[PDB]
Design a protein around this ligand. Structure first.
Ligand SMILES: Nc1ncnc2c1ncn2[C@@H]1O[C@H](CN(CCO)CC[C@H]([NH3+])C(=O)[O-])[C@@H](O)[C@H]1O
Ligand SMILES: [Mg+2]
Length: 91
RNA sequence: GGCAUUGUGCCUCGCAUUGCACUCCGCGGGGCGAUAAGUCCUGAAAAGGGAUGUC
């Protein structure tokens, strides 16, 4: 808060992992270089995603711009990740 | 290829689920080594790939 990583939820759980990942990437890539998307369809982690930006400017612009955007017929809910993703905590 | 066991992850249907991960598996049916994926394995890596037993 802020953070390199944004946590998206209220996502449409019927989307296949591999295309949700590439969809998040194609859309959020417009707000800066991206290092990873982490997506699981587990019961704990379905409906959600972590997209990890290289620079925090990117993240906060993505969080402000894309808040509530209609994505696969649901409005995205975007917060800052509560904590640093492991790949940005190694640097 | 068949069979047993099994690591690993994918798809789909019903019910359920708004859930802060990188220490990762909802329940119940159905379909999977596949040029997906993988948290499992091989390699010193970049890359690659189920495994052990048994006809
Ligand atoms: N990565 C793969 N790619 C293609 N197929 C796979 C793959 N992993 C597994 N299977 C399939 O699962 C079957 C074996 N079951 C047990 C029954 O024997 C394991 C189920 C699962 N591990 C579980 O614990 O719920 C194999 O024959 C494959 O068809
Ligand atoms: Mg099932």
């Amino acid at each position: 808060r802020p953070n390199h990583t944004i946590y998206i939820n209220n996502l449409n759980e019927k989307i296949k992992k591999d295309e949700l990942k590439k969809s998040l990437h194609a859309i959020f890539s417009r707000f800066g270089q991206i290092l990873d998307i982490l997506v699981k369809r587990s019961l704990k982690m379905r409906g959600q995603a972590f997209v990890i930006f290289k620079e925090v400017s990117s993240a906060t612009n993505a969080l402000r711009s894309m808040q509530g955007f209609p994505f696969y017929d649901k409005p995205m809910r975007i917060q800052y990740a509560k904590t640093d993703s492991d790949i940005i905590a190694k640097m």
